[model samples]
Target: EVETFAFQAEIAQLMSLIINTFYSNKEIFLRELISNSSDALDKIRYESLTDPSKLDSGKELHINLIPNKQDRTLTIVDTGIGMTKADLINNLGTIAKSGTKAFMEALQAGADISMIGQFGVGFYSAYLVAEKVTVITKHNDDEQYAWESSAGGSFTVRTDTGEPMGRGTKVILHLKEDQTEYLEERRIKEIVKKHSQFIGYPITLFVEK
Candidate 1:
């Protein structure tokens, strides 16, 4: 099943204007993303504590940062807890704080990158580097669906045919022209080690053969 919905009119306008105000501070975008991947990995493992009904390999948790030079897309993937259809619709539509008003307060505080995911819209910080973002995700229980946006007040969600996220989320960042430095394996690794090495799970850089 596929459906497209708009952010509430309130969200539609702010989602457009909010991120631009943060571009000067965009260096944290990747850090914010890596921080998010770590949390998702933690969510699944923590679920395994009492339920263990999660992944058959209840202990397997990982994150991958994929970089491509061909068209310069950076994809962040995690083999961790993902979202269902409703989760996508309700959660992705807003920054997940009370409103963009809260988002603005956080933005001005020189908020630590650590708090990005806690607020829910760290997902949108990817816009700092890319012109667009495509999220392909599958919860262990739901079919795969993709949510995408170019940072206007709107985004779309639809079913994916090529492959399901299997058991987590994959965030694709279509880079802007000057942001191509994110495409290098070495640079990506360095950033991961610097901001992500202390994280809960393994963070690996994908290299194509």
Candidate 2:
């Protein structure tokens, strides 16, 4: 069964702000997404320190960018700490309710993860170039789930057993018609190199031709 939820108080405002203010540099959305994946990798690494079972997947921590011209979609995949259903609701459904922020605060003093989505608004930037966004994720402790939004007043989340994520997150962007330039591998590589070159994890892109 699919569950639908209304956007929280500030989310509409946040989306408008991101789409308007960041529109000039639309490619920044890719950087924001990649940084988010990096943060997830950091979280899993930190958790595995005490709970070795968290690393049982043995998946190397990395991010992959897949651009599909035919589908007019761009996908960002990460072998990192995927979110649970509640996480999808709290983190993505609400504005400024960041899981990264909560995770960092819970760590108190010892670890520093260099958060990227501290304000919880980075993900909304996806609306800058996407007509719809889908997040397929799996956490070791929870079942796989898919969360989708059209940057409207509501979104839907459901149990997605179709494509298993092992233990990570996959973000798919259904690009707006005018944003087709983002489908080019060269353009994506250029954006990654320009903005996220020094990010901790390896970022790979699928290229055709």
Candidate 3:
């Protein structure tokens, strides 16, 4: 069954306030997402060391950062540890529940202070410049599923019958009205170079020809 979950009232309001009204710049959203990707890579690589089966044949540990100019979309792909449907619910369902007090403090500190992965709210930061956020992932133990959200409190996770990811994650951020800079290849590379330069992955850039 497809599951729909809503963010806690307090957390939803705080994320909306911080990402849209409070934050001034939009470029940093790229850094938050890629940084989280690096973390995902680290997790999968670490697990594969002990359990080689964790990785699929076609999927290797890497990151694919691509921007679709025509559609105004920025897609980040990672052949890392993908999340199961249940994991998605746990991660994004009620982000505030994991650490409510800490989340409140991080929101006050600003973007650089709080990032993706830790508080389960980092993913929501993408809503700053994205009208819709789509995530497709396949975990070793679960069927492939896609999750979509507008940061409007509720999100949906459903079975994906499209091309399989093998075992990884791909996040498609459909840019909003003012997020034109993300469509430029140079700008995307520069942002990755600036913030996620320390990430060990190659951070390859791909655009549909």
Candidate 4:
């Protein structure tokens, strides 16, 4: 059994800052999360180029958004590098090696960290809109796992028995009432193109009529 670490007081403060004052515009959350998804697609594509076998495994690198009106749920799925259970915890829960931290450290140490996006933690932007977030991931190396959190106290990681979708991650957002704009197809597509048009991969949306 893997032991999970509690969030440090400083980290908790950071989260509160982000959840409160950091995001001046609520719509920016969609942009941030989509940008991160684009980065993931880029990473997998680069990796596949070196190891062609990886391409054969799950080369269809794309992002898709499915919205459910009845439940007010918006799911964003990406065919990118899926994370394991440990990765989910380390990435979503604790303040491990984050992209922001890496950038700051580079500046302090006088290292060229121009590629700060390569570091991760962009996925946490989901919490900006979601009251509860469920991540279902199928990694190329390990069994699929689901990470669920309410962004309150604790998060649960459990074995995922769903059918594997080649290789990638899917984020199901239980969108908050005030964040209903994300459930609209046109709005979501606009956000994707505006912020993620230059993304290395194609992004598709499945709208429910």
Candidate 5:
């Protein structure tokens, strides 16, 4: 079934503001992505206890950074819970939290705005650095799917032909020329440690000199 929803005009404005203004540290992009990967690993590890098969899937729940200087593409791969096509749309396309009206009402009621952090907007930050962002994911519940967008208007979703991720997702960022600092190992590592050092999973950098 196809479903559609619209954001309150003002909330849409809020999203744009949060994406652009609230997040000032451009380097936080890697940290945010790594934090997400770490969360996925935690989820898979918790699930493995009940489903032993999860542990045998050859999915180690780790994060990998691959930078291709030739193409100016920096790919971050992870083996964690992935999103399905519907998830990509609902989570990426629309604001599924208390709708715009409800959110504003809550604020008026003195609700803690900090609670908004629990929402899923973190993934959208890729638009700040990538000209085109590609998400290659394989969910345990559905087929592998690729979600691609330039954050211009709409995103394209397609089925992946190769192997499913076994249990995770990979976000490949085609970095803009101004964002090339992310391609350096020293820079990537520093960012990772600053924001994600306490994270439980290991973040590795695969660099070529």
Candidate 6:
């Protein structure tokens, strides 16, 4: 069953701020997303160290950037510790109330906050380039779930009844009209070089000639 809920009151305001005020540095959206997946990979690896059983079918821990020119979407897939329904709601729903508050304060003061992850709002930066964002994640301890949001005041979370996904996460970004540059392999590699080159895990970009 698909469940829909409204974003917290503060989330609406924060979305507008990020979409409008945070518009100039939109390229960093890739950085923020890659940074997030890297963290997820790090978490799973750390857990496997103590409990070897934590490894999910011995799948390689890495990230894949798939850009679909026809569909006009960019998908980031990661074989890492996925999220539960509760994790989706809490992390994607509430979005660290204090994080948004501090972000707004920093923006209002005209301070250049170097990293969006520091404020815990890195995920929302997807709206900087995407019109709609879909996240399908499967945690070892939880069933697969899909979360969809369009930066509107509401979002949806539902049990994924489709094909079974590996123990990881896949974020599909339906690109906005003006953000088509992201669909290019060169642009993606450039962004990766600028921001995610040092990520411990592999960040592979699928390119088709």
Best by TM-score: 6
TM-score of 5: 0.78
Model 3 C-alpha lDDT per residue in residues 1-209, reported as the tens digit of each score:
67788867766775676555745666767777887788888988898889877765344778898888788898999887788877887754454566545666675676442444466556667877788999999888889999988777888899999997888889999998888788888888788878788888878888567
| Best-matching candidate per lDDT | 6
| Model 1 TM | 0.85
- lDDT tens digits by residue: candidate 1, 1-209: 56667777756555565454534655567888877778788888888889877877335688888888886899998888887888888864544636455665775787643355556666666876888888898887778889888866667888888664558889999999988988887877777777666786777788954
Provide the global lDDT of candidate 6 against the true structure. Answer: 0.86
Summing lDDT over every window of 10 consecutive residues in candidate 5, give the lowest-scoring window: 1-10
Stretches off by above 4 angstroms in model 2 are: 20-22, 91-118
User: How many clashes in each candidate?
Assistant: 0, 0, 0, 0, 1, 0
Over the stretch 151-201, how does candidate 6's per-residue lDDT look in tens digits?
A: 768889999997787789999999999999999999999999998889999
Clashing pairs in 1: none
- The TM-score that candidate 3 achieves is 0.87
Total backbone clashes of model 3? 0
Alpha-carbon RMSD of each model:
2.8, 6.4, 2.6, 4.9, 4.5, 1.6
Q: What is the TM-score of each candidate against the true structure?
A: 0.85, 0.85, 0.87, 0.79, 0.78, 0.94
- Tens digit of lDDT per residue, candidate 4, span 1-209? 32334554434543444455434355656666677677667777888778888766676888888999899998888888777766776644454435546544654676332233344545556666788888788777778888776655456787777776777888899998888988988898788777667776677789697
Q: What's the ranking of the predictions by lDDT, best on top?
A: 6, 2, 3, 1, 5, 4
Candidate 3 regions with alpha-carbon error over 4 angstroms: 57-59, 91-100, 106-120
Which window of 10 residues has the lowest lDDT sum in candidate 4?
111-120
Backbone collision tally, model 6: 0
- Cα lDDT, all candidates: 0.75, 0.79, 0.77, 0.69, 0.69, 0.86
Residue by residue across 1-209, what tens digits does model 5's lDDT show? 22234544554544554345534466656766776787777888888889978666565768898988888888988888777777776654456444444554664686433333344445555656777888898777788888776543355677877665776888999998888888888888887778778877767789776
Worst ten in a row by lDDT for model 3 = 111-120
lDDT: the better of candidates 1 and 3? 3
Better of 4 and 6 by TM-score: 6
Reference-based lDDT, residue 59, model 2: 51
For candidate 6, the TM-score is: 0.94
